[PDB]
Design a protein around this ligand. Structure first.
Ligand SMILES: Nc1nc2c(ncn2[C@@H]2O[C@H](COP(=O)(O)OP(=O)(O)O)[C@@H](O)[C@H]2O)c(=O)[nH]1
Ligand SMILES: Nc1nc2c(ncn2[C@@H]2O[C@H](COP(=O)(O)OP(=O)(O)O)[C@@H](O)[C@H]2O)c(=O)[nH]1
Ligand SMILES: [Mg+2]
Ligand SMILES: [Mg+2]
Lengths: 169, 169
């Protein structure tokens, strides 16, 4: 069956890179418009929508168009945050994303940290919300490290999706 | 579990009336903005979003707001059409709705005819698309007729939703 994933975050967070890691190929450009791309993973079609710098008239059109790509809706919304580079304008984007989607959306949202290889109040506030539902990625990983991290990432997404008691009917 | 239903159609189609019939109480006004209302039906929470005359800047804001009400997405999108009163500007709305949502959306869309009690090329084109997935309502029905028609309507929605092979993961 089909697993629909949307990536949100500030420009420079690593959305497109994360999408590449999910899909297991370099297809997003690591973004002036929303792009939908697919892969086959085991018996699952992964459908990933990468988003441009959405977070006023032109943006609204593009938001509507982005939403229509994942109809009737996604299974998982991935908030992508760059470790180390999460400072002022990076948290300004996160508070707006969270205010926009609100409490209801929390059950299908997952926090993705990028720049794990480059290894705080703003980070601990995030973790108070997504403590159970988060992942750290090194999107530059290759070989076995890359394959292991992809499995762990898809495993989390599937876990959150199966647990979403307000997902399916 | 929760069953999320969105109503689309031209002003005067009977959206709000249909929503009342689904929810089993007169709560929509039979609409300047999207309104979300709920009922308990057996072990199911029915969540119905009634829409205003969406089908340019203000509309886009309101579309985004309408979409956020049913996050991550609806299970069923109900296209509401008034029998007898389906002429020129009524089909103009339908072609735009269908172009907007496109082929993908067809699997979760259901055709609802209103004004059954008031008992063609435009109608046969519709039926070529929704032959298996349609219902006719008399939203003025009371008593047993009302209860019978509500059961048949909820039964169709649940059927379409369980059959949607691109719905749940
Ligand atoms: N070192 C490192 N760089 C990353 C990682 N993820 C993304 N990047 C880099 O961060 C920059 C922005 O990435 P990009 O995918 O375009 O971010 P986007 O704007 O959110 O789509 C690029 O230089 C990427 O190569 C990571 O996990 N580690
Ligand atoms: N006779 C009859 N009138 C209906 C039916 N459904 C809706 N109406 C009437 O059609 C008019 C428009 O209905 P309304 O729910 O406000 O349509 P909306 O603009 O799509 O929300 C009102 O007069 C309703 O009472 C129906 O099944 N039979
Ligand atoms: Mg990008
Ligand atoms: Mg109305």
């Amino acid at each position: 069956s089909q697993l629909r994933i949307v990536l949100v975050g500030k420009t420079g967070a690593g959305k497109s890179a994360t999408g590449n890691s999910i899909l297991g190929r370099k297809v997003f450009h690591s973004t002036k418009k929303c792009e939908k791309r697919s892969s086959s993973w085991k018996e699952t079609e992964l459908v990933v929508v990468d988003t441009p710098g959405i977070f006023n008239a032109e943006t609204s059109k593009e938001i509507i168009r982005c939403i229509l790509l994942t109809s009737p809706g996604p299974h998982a919304l991935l908030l992508v945050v760059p470790l180390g580079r999460y400072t002022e304008e990076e948290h300004k984007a996160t508070e707006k994303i969270l205010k926009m989607f609100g409490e209801r959306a929390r059950s299908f949202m997952i926090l993705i940290f990028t720049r794990k290889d480059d290894l705080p109040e703003d980070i601990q506030d995030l973790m108070d919300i997504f403590g159970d539902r988060y992942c750290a990625l090194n999107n530059k990983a290759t070989g076995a490290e890359q394959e292991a991290q992809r499995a762990q990432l898809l495993g989390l997404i599937q876990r959150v999706v199966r647990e979403n008691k307000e997902g399916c009917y």
